[PDB]
């Protein structure tokens, strides 16, 4: 949930759920763990683009799942030969799959295994739009050479 691909919406006390094209998701958050304070609590309720892919896949291949957020290291960035975050969680068997914003590259195709890409992406450029102008020779347009 570092993206407009998947979104977390804080839990609703008006009903107790979301249930509108949404799904629950945990966050076993540990913080200020200087007194061995046991972690965990239900953070926001989840929904987003990758989430819908998830649901439809689950109903088409018949499993069930257990969504929970990461703690540290948003994506995989190796440090001292170790993976932190969404790729560690797959290499330490503390998970089975990881969905969301997660690109593809050799540096990851040895630790984890990858699915078929479902979006295009890469490096591209943004520009602004130039207003419409008039040729320096407009005043000769409206008559073919003969006339």
């Amino acid at each position: 949930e570092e993206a407009p691909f998947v979104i977390v919406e804080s839990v609703d006390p008006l009903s107790g759920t979301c249930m509108r094209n949404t799904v629950p998701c945990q966050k076993r958050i540990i913080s200020e763990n200087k007194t061995d304070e046991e972690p965990g609590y239900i953070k926001k309720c989840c929904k987003g683009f990758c989430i819908d892919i998830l649901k439809k896949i689950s109903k088409s291949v018949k499993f069930t799942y257990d969504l929970y957020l990461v703690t540290n290291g948003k994506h995989g960035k190796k440090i001292n030969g170790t993976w932190n975050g969404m790729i560690g969680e797959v290499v330490m068997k503390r998970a089975y799959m990881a969905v969301g914003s997660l690109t593809i590259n050799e540096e990851r195709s040895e630790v984890v295994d990858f699915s078929v890409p479902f979006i295009e992406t890469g490096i591209s450029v943004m520009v602004s739009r130039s207003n419409g102008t008039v040729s320096p020779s407009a005043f000769l347009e409206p008559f073919s050479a003969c006339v």
């Binding site: 050799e106 890409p117 347009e141 409206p142 008559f143 073919s144 003969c146 006339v147």
Partner: protein
């Protein structure tokens, strides 16, 4: 091909498919020469094969909106020992910058460009009325001249 595979197993395009079955061609090399002869009015294919046309020739042009999304790939029988090494060597060729070099060498010429098709300046074949009337004026003069000499 894959396009008819896409249209058949689609249902909202039942009538579309029902229409196409009567005309589909043998290979794009024929469909292009059939569009440039006005024996056809459209054609549907893989974008990256059309875009090379709008650039080499420049009397054809596409209609922008990007359709069903895919990606080309290589084919190997299921469970072959070569699979993993190949699918790795590909990914190498997308950060060292190799595929960009192949791209530029073979596609992306942009030799012809289109922008704001002109509002079609007039020409010699429709202003023909006024020149006819001035000629006819020349004629009538050679008649109505003598009538003066007579009335003199």
């Amino acid at each position: 091909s894959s396009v008819d595979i896409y249209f058949r197993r689609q249902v909202e395009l039942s009538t579309m498919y029902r229409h196409m079955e009567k005309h589909n061609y043998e290979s794009a090399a024929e469909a292009i020469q059939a569009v440039r002869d006005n024996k056809l009015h459209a054609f549907i294919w893989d974008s990256a094969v059309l875009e090379f046309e709008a650039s080499q020739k420049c009397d054809l042009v596409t209609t922008g909106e990007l359709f069903f999304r895919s990606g080309f790939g290589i084919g190997m029988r299921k469970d072959s020992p070569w699979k993993q090494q190949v699918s790795l060597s590909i990914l190498k060729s997308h950060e060292n910058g190799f595929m960009e070099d192949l791209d530029k060498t073979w596609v992306r010429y942009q030799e012809c460009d289109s922008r704001s098709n002109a509002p079609a300046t007039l020409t010699c074949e429709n202003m023909a009325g006024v020149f006819m009337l001035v000629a006819g004026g020349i004629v009538a003069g050679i008649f109505l001249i003598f009538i003066e000499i007579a009335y003199k």
